[PDB]
Design a protein around this nucleic acid. Structure first.
Lengths: 122, 77, 87, 83
RNA sequence: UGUACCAUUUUGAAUAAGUGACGACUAACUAUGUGCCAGCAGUCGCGGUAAUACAUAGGUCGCAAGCGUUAUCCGGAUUUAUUGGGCGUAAAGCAAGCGCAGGCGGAUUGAAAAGUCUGGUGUUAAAGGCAGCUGCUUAACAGUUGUAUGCAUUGGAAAC
RNA sequence: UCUGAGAGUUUGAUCCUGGCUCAGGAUUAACGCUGGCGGCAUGCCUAAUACAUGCAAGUCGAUCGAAAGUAGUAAUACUUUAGAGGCGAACGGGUGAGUAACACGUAUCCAAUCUACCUUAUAAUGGGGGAUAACUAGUUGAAAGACUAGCUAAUACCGCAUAAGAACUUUGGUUCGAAUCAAAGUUGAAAGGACCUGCAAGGGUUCGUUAUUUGAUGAGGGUGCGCCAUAUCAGCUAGUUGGUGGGGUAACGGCCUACCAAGGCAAUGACGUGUAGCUAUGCUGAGAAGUAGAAUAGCCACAAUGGGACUGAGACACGGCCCAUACUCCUACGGGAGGCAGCAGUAGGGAAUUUUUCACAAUGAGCGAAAGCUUGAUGGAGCAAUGCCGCG
RNA sequence: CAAGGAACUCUGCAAAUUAACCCCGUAAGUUAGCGAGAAGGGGUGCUUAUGUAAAAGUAAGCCGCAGUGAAGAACGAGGGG
């Protein structure tokens, strides 16, 4: 249940080691972003040779959550960290490779490029 | 990749297993000779070393060095 | 095995071989131990003089000629002074 | 008997390290382009076998050998008296 | 690879020249225009209304299937002076003194012999450099033979 | 016996001190203009940047069984090997990032080493066992495949018999740790294929096996001397110094290990900084030598980056394996695959450095008794006035 | 008290973390005294053996999610007036 101003790990090869939430999108007073919901963020820590410098504002798609969320078929997936991917305004990540597993609820919303690049979907 | 390397990848594995099996029985015979000392045990050790000394599993100078250091402890008396 | 081979020392279109006592695991026109005459396989009629001094020593302490070296060892009579002194 | 030797008279500085002695050598060489003559020091190492305890001022001779250990490379051959 | 090449094989002057400079250094000079303006330049420096230095024209000369410019290396540069430089006024003697280390250091006799000199031996790949020769129609080029140098070790010498 | 050229420029004018510049060659050169041919050499120096694409080390049926195919009524004979097995794969190609040090040059010792194919010579090449590819059947996927159960032969493996001499110790004496002798103990050796002969018995030839005795050869270890600048780098180093016991290693060794001590290097430049593959050589110089390490050759290091180890005698393996890191590509989302600094070629950079070219004809290498096969090593051709020379 | 970790707010107020002993390790600055418990990390339980004068210490082994198992113990870093 990543909320407003939630620093969280990054799961691609953009070099964005530590990024925090700046606003949750989709409506007024959303105050929560579950698996799949697109958020805007602001990179607060990167690598020197990165395609994104510190202080930029960018939109990202959350992939891994610590709280988890009940799935329709009864199962309740739950990771142990908060991750995201750096999309570029339609469906595509700003990076080329994806680190770690990615949730499945990104299948329906779109984002099929992520699932293609994902190492192992769960 | 070139064809004449993965064939060697097949051949090497079985002789690797065989050579490991011989090496470990050399080693256990040598342990047997440490825990108890007699002419018979070390003679088995000499024979067992010469088995590989025919081939290239153990370097022959290693075999002679080990059997020399074993006759060294034979020379306790 | 040390092999008696050919070394194409010369300009384009004009090979001019010095016969060489070189090891098997050595590239063409590389360093060697001793020198064995030379050859100009364009000029005919005995343009192929050889030292005959250290070549027999090489053969007597291990050497392997080649077909073009077999040719030269044939006419000069190396065989009739080598295989009999062998016994 | 074709093994070689380097007969280089040295001087024993201190054998404070147990049963090992430090020798000093002075080779005279011409400077490559100035043609003057200068002599330099180059410390060497030889371990005490126990035959004679070389105190300060003992100058001896040295012979080549196998590597006895790292930084201990040569052994004594002939010993000359004190001064 | 019908390859080079050869063969009174066909025809035909026909199928082929640019380039840099011209004040001096450094061989090569006149005119027109421009008139501190446009521009030239390795150095000196040229032009504010007669320019052999700018632009062009003519002419001349220096190279030529290459010619010029820029970039780098050595030389000239004895301008890092070992060969082979100086320190009064041109750059350069510290403000002076006590002085460790180091460098250098009277005369005589002996020894050893590190240096020093010379004798032998081993070794210092080929190509390349030098010289001769050979073969390319000859140089370009390819090949042959001879050619230094240093080091280790060994016999002596014993001025220093 | 070799060989040494100057000139302009500070001044009203002069001599000197002194700096700059030119007159000479040379280039892995490039740019402008022009451009006919021939011969010879050379052609990314920037990004050890990333790569579309095609080819770069395979061979062997006289090793094996079996498979497929052809002649045959059959017996049989012939052609290829998917696989097992032998060797080769560690050479040969490329590049110079790293490395300032036994890396290189060079002189040496290895009483410290080993080295298959090659070389002198000797003994034997006996007899058994147990296994597995392929095949089949199944599971399983489009395929790559993988896994499950039976079947096989060998020059694949493993015991057994005897060891000429070895290998190692036991005992005796020899010589100036080495080497040789004598006796004893323990221990280990193969594989057969093709052929001739032989009614047979068996004998023999060629190819092959193991153990042996010299070497050739190659690799490795160590030392001498030489092999950059920098003090606007003063301390540096604790397996570091030395010893003891053991292990380890082709061998020496704090190489590691358990114990003991604190030592060692350093102004004659330690440690650090930046720089760089070293050497022969090229250009220049009369020379002392300055200078770059072009083509090429010896040595060294590397194979996208970082580690590990098998096998092999030889790799810590450029187109072998495992792992991790980064990048990319393909896909049927299930998964995979790759490492152009090999020859061509592309992208980028740069001002700049070429054909996605032919043939083993020759040298060679590898295998194969032999035919023969592979070779972007090599030999050739295409391009380039880039250079030297000759001819128009 | 799950997820988040100052978004609260006039301000991290309050609350929360660390805390004992032993062992590594400690910078800028300075009036050379300090900074400094700077910072940042590791160990503690039980049994046997070995420990020496007692004990610290050391080796081997065992258990739990956790071993000053409770109680009592400093949260720091940087800049400025």
């Amino acid at each position: 249940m990543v909320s407003f101003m939630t620093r969280l790990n990054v799961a691609d090869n953009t070099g964005a080691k530590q990024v925090g939430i700046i606003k949750v999108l989709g409506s007024t007073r959303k105050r929560y972003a579950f698996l799949g919901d697109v958020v805007v963020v602001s990179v607060k820590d990167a690598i020197p040779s990165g395609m994104v410098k510190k202080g930029q504002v960018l939109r990202a798609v959350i992939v891994r959550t610590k709280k988890g969320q009940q799935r329709k078929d009864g199962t309740h997936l739950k990771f142990d960290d908060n991750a995201c991917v750096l999309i570029k305004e339609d469906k595509s990540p700003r990076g080329t490779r994806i680190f770690g597993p990615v949730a499945r609820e990104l299948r329906e919303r779109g984002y099929n490029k992520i699932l293609s690049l994902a190492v192992e979907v769960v | 990749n070139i064809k004449s390397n993965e064939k060697r990848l097949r051949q090497n594995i079985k002789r690797n297993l065989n050579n490991k099996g011989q090496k470990t029985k050399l080693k256990t015979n040598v342990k047997n000779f440490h825990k108890e000392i007699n002419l018979d045990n070390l003679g088995n050790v000499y024979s067992q070393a010469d088995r590989l000394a025919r081939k290239g599993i153990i370097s022959t100078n290693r075999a002679r060095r080990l059997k020399s250091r074993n006759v060294a402890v034979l020379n306790k008396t | 095995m040390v092999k008696i081979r050919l070394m194409r020392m010369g300009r384009v279109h004009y090979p001019t071989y010095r016969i060489v006592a070189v090891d098997s695991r050595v590239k063409r026109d590389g360093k060697y131990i001793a020198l064995i005459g030379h050859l100009n396989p364009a000029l005919k009629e005995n343009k192929c003089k050889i030292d005959e001094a250290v070549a027999l020593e090489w053969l007597n302490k291990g050497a392997k000629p080649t077909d073009t070296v077999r040719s030269l060892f044939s006419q000069t009579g190396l065989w009739k002074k080598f295989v009999e002194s062998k016994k | 008997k074709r093994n070689q030797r380097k007969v280089l008279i040295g001087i024993v500085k201190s054998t404070k390290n147990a049963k090992t002695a430090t020798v000093q050598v002075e080779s005279r060489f011409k400077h490559p382009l100035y043609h003057k003559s200068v002599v330099r020091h180059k410390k060497y190492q030889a371990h005490n076998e126990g035959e004679v305890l070389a105190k300060d001022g003992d100058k001896v001779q040295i012979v080549e050998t196998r590597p006895l250990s790292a930084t201990k490379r040569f052994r004594i051959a002939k010993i000359i008296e004190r001064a």
